[PDB]
Amino acid sequence: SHMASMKKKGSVVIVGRINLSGDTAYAQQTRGEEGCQETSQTGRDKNQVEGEVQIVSTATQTFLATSINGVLWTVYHGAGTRTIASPKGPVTQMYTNVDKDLVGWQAPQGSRSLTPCTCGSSDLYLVTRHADVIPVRRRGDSRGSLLSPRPISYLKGSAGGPLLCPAGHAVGIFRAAVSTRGVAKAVAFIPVESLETTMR
Ligand SMILES: CC(C)(C)OC(=O)N[C@H]1CCCCC/C=C\[C@@H]2C[C@@]2(C(=O)NS(=O)(=O)C2CC2)NC(=O)[C@@H]2C[C@@H](OC(=O)n3cc4cccc(F)c4c3)CN2C1=O
Ligand SMILES: [Zn+2]
């Protein structure tokens, strides 16, 4: 092909967060669309990062990314092999596993990391991009059922978000919804143990 005109993929850009610091969970936007587009091109993001759950965007998709053990994790089906924007330019993935639908980068300065759960509890909570905290009963290694099913529309854009135990530890990263007639009855997630193995 004409090699001189081949384009490069933009970086993933942090565009907001899910604030879990207080008694009320809520989404905050930290960058609008024009800034996002420019930042994706340059890979240079000088915005302050805070919190555990980031809202992230590419040119075509928006989803979540969650810091656990000093790594910002998200789904491969959202990020592909993309770099993430940072104050000093694009940062290359430190983990990539298409078979797990998993990617990770070093956690941004200013972020806070969730602690991996060792409670062995099956009472979980899924945090969505709209800051809904959805009770989920763990049903296996990588699945849980919604206590209150809802349309898949409500979950779209939340891949990369956490499933948490009652004590607020990370149990997994949301990757897929299990649905019947458009209603999500269950969720599939990357268990935190699988993240911990990937880190080895
Ligand atoms: C796996 C099973 C049981 C057959 O189910 C499903 O395939 N179901 C569907 C239902 C889709 C309807 C919307 C559901 C709403 C929210 C879904 C959470 C979500 C999302 O919000 N993405 S996103 O908008 O943020 C997006 C911007 C990031 N993910 C998806 O859509 C994913 C993406 C795609 O799956 C994968 O490419 N892989 C690769 C995997 C490798 C290993 C293990 C896996 F499981 C893998 C899943 C299909 N997906 C589903 O969920
Ligand atoms: Zn726990």
Author numbering: 981 to 1180
Article sentences:
The HCV NS3/4A protease – a chymotrypsin-like serine protease – is a prime therapeutic target that cleaves four known sites along the virally encoded polyprotein. The NS3/4A protease also hydrolyzes two human proteins, TRIF and MAVS, which are part of the innate immune system, thereby confounding the innate immune response to viral infection. In this study, we report that four chemically representative protease inhibitors – telaprevir, danoprevir, vaniprevir and MK-5172 – exhibit distinct susceptibilities to the protease variants R155K, A156T and D168A. To elucidate the underlying mechanism by which chemically diverse inhibitors bind to the wild-type protease and drug-resistant variants, crystal structures were determined for 16 inhibitor-protease complexes. These complexes include wild-type protease and resistant variants R155K, D168A and A156T each bound to telaprevir, danoprevir, vaniprevir and MK-5172, with resolutions ranging from 1.10–2.50 Å; S139A protease variants were used except for telaprevir, which requires covalent bond formation with the serine 139 for efficient binding.
